[PDB]
Write a protein that binds this ligand. Sequence first.
Ligand SMILES: [Ca+2]
Lengths: 5, 279
Amino acid sequence: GALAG
Amino acid sequence: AAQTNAPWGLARISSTSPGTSTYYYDESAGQGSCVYVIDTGIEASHPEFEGRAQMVKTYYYSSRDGNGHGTHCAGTVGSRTYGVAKKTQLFGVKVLDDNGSGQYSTIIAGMDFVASDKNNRNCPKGVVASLSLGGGYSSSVNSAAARLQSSGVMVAVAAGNNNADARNYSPASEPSVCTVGASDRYDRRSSFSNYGSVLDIFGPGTDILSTWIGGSTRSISGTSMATPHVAGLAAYLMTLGKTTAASACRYIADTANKGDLSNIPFGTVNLLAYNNYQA
Ligand SMILES: [Ca+2]
């Protein structure tokens, strides 16, 4: 992810 | 089988073109497969799961989803109305707190847990794990995702929502798993979706209607929403015997709609998850 949704 | 007036995302994954409203799928519907949703938990009592969902592990005071995110993702995997694989078994692993946050050590433990726990479960058609989470690059987080995949679980992870190269994010940047970007109903890359060479596939991620806590529904956006579309599709395809956990990501990429998306930067795959259903 990252911010992931 | 056909679901009329389906959420746009479900319709999209069963069509070669945007703008349709029917979700076409094989009636087997992922029966015999199992999907672990590693998130804020799952409201297992929601009528939409029809008793096919259960919490198996929490890393917090309760196993309850006090957030909604996990329930929403689980819904896109396998709820009756909003799910890709409508007869799959759902297992909830709560590694994120009710604010949607979690430490890397906990997320890793959750992945290691799934690798072991699957050996205790009856999942004849195969096992999938859906990880709609992430943060900054971590070799240890990447390693944990790699282990889970290696253990024989189809791992799908969100690319992230920073409109940046996913190489700087984990577990998105782990090459061995299935890294999922997001698209909208007009076949554009979602404005927030991460991109880059590490992406394997795109799924519907903008304005996704699914289940929510308190027995409700809502529409939200993110690569978090695209990931369960791919995870559900994997479970669906494994049940049909078309692919295995080891090669599902490759098979999905191979059989995807190609070149349909706009606003894809050079070096990023132009591939959209597609079920190839023919009655
Ligand atoms: Ca990959």
